[PDB]
Amino acid sequence: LKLMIKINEAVFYDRITSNKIIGTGHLFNREGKKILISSSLEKIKNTPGAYIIRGQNNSAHKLRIRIGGEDWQPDNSGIGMVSHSDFTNEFNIYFFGNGDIPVDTYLISIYATEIVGNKAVVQAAVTIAAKLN
Question: Which regions span the lipid bilayer (predicted)?
Answer without folding.
Answer: none
